[PDB]
Amino acid sequence: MFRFGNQKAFEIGKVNIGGEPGDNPTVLIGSIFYGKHKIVEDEKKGIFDKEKAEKLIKEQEELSDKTGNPGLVDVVGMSEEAIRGYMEFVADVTDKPFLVDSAIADIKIAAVEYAKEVGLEKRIIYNSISPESKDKEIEALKNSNIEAAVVLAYTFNVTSSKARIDALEKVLPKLEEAGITKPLIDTFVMDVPSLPAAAKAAMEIKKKYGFPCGSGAHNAIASWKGFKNMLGKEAEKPAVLMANTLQIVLGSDFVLYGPIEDSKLVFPAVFTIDTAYRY
Amino acid sequence: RFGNQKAFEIGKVNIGGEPGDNPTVLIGSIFYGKHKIVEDEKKGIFDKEKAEKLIKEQEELSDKTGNPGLVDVVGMSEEAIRGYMEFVADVTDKPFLVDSAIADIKIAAVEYAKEVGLEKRIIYNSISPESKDKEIEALKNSNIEAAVVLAYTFNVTSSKARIDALEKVLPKLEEAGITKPLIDTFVMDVPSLPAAAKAAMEIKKKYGFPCGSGAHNAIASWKGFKNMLGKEAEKPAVLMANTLQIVLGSDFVLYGPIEDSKLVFPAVFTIDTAYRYFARTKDLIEI
Structure with a gap:
C-alpha cells in the first residue's frame, strides 16, 4: 500500500497535519485578503467586507466538518496595518490555527509582534521561511512562542527535486534558532x-x-x-x-x-482522493 | 520512458506511448442513458443541433490543447445506434467508439460500419472476459482493428485480478483480429x-x-x-x-x-503539459 513509514503528524492548535496518504486527512489551506481580493476595499489600510469575509471562512469550515479534511485560513497582508486587522478578524471568527502570509519580511515580523501583543502566538503559522529569509525574521520568531512555520523550499532550478531538498536543508538550522518545532x-x-x-x-x-x-x-x-x-x-x-x-x-x-472561494472545488476533490487511498 | 510502449494510430489519432510523450486521449459519451438531447432512445430521435454542438465543442478544445477528443456513441437499440453512427460520422472525421451494454447492439454497430466503410474509424467498446462468442465472430468478420478491453472483475480492489481479466481476453483479441486493444x-x-x-x-x-x-x-x-x-x-x-x-x-x-469536456480537457492538459517536461526521465517513472 501507498505508505512512506515513520511520518510525522504535527499538532498545531489542535489540528493534525502530516502522516500517510489516505490514513491521515489532507489539510486544505485557503487564502483570504490576497492581492486584488474583491472583498477588500483598501489593501493598504486593510478595509474589507466583514460579512463576506466571515462567510468565506465559515463555508470552508462547513466543508471541513463534512469531509474531515481540516480547513485552515491563509491570511495575506499587503501592509503591516492591514495584516494586524486581518489577524484580529480571523481570530474572532474561528478557533482554528491560521497562517500569516506575506512576501515582505517586515509584514510577517509585524504579524509575529501583533500575535505576541494580543495573544495569538500558538495559533499562528509563519508563511514562510526560506533560504532567503532575513536574520531579523529568525530573531522575531526566536523571541516568540510561535512553534509552526511553512518552509518554502525555494530554488531557481524549478525542475529539480534535489534542489528543493537542498533548500530545506539550508532552512533547517534557521528553524532550530527560531524555535520552530513543527515545520510544514x-x-x-x-x-x-x-x-x-x-x-x-x-x-x-x-x-x-x-x-x-x-x-x-x-x-x-x-x-x-x-x-x-x-x-x-x-x-x-x-x-x-x-x-x-x-x-x-x-x-x-x-x-x-x-x-x-475555491473551497467548494478543492474539498470534494481531495476528499475523493483521501477516501480512495484510505479504503 | 523505457521503449516498450505501443502507440496505436486509429483513424490518424495516436493513443498511448511512453508516459509523458504524447497527449492523453479524452473520450466523451453522447446519447447515453437519459441524455436530455435524446427525445426517443429506441428510435434514436435527438436534437441534431445540440448534438453537433457538443461534438464540435469537444473538438475545439482538442484543437487547442492537442488532446485528441473522441466521441463514445451509446446505443440503446440497434436502429438508434446505426443512426447515431451515421450522424457522428457525418459531423467529424475522427475515429469514434461504439458503446452498448447489449451485445446485439454492438454487433449491429459493427455490421453498419462494414456496410458504409467505417471499420478503420470504429473502436468497439468493449470486449470483456464475459463477451459473447457472437461478438468475437462479428469482429473477426470485419476489418475493425481497435477495441476497448474492459478488465472486468468482481474483485474490485485487486490489480492482479484486472491483469488476469485482460489475459482471459487476449485470445479473444487474436480470434477477432483486434490488433489495437485499449x-x-x-x-x-x-x-x-x-x-x-x-x-x-x-x-x-x-x-x-x-x-x-x-x-x-x-x-x-x-x-x-x-x-x-x-x-x-x-x-x-x-x-x-x-x-x-x-x-x-x-x-x-x-x-x-x-458535456464535461470543458472540465476534463483543461485539467488533463495541465497534467500532460507538466509531464511533457519530464518525458523520458527517470524522475517521472519514480514520481
Missing part, C-alpha cells in the same frame, strides 16, 4: 514544469525527514502564459484544481490551494 | 481507483498496450456523497476520479458525458 514544507510550485519536481521533492522529504509536505499551484496556472487567452477564464478552475491535487494523488499532506 | 482497467467505486491505476501500470510494463479508465460511475454510486455535499460537488469529485490514473501514467480517459 512547501515544496514550491512556481510554474507548470515545477509540478512534478515539487511532488517528487515531497516524496523524498517525507522519506528522509517525515515532515508534512505540500504546495500550491494557483500560481502555476496564473503564470501560464497564453493559457487563459486560449482556453478562457472558466477553464482556469479545473486546471487550478488539477494542479492543486496532483501532489495529493502523489502522497502529500496539505494544499495551499489559493483563493478561499 | 485497456480499460475498470474503475468501479472510489476505493478501486488505485487498483485500476496499478493494474494499468503493470499492463504497460508487461504488454505495451495503451491503458485508461473512467470513473463517472464511481461518484454516482458513492452512497451518501450527494446527501452530504452538494450535487454540484460531484463535478470536482468526478474530475479527480477521471484524472488520478493520468497522474499515475495512463493514456486515455472515458470521462463520461461529453
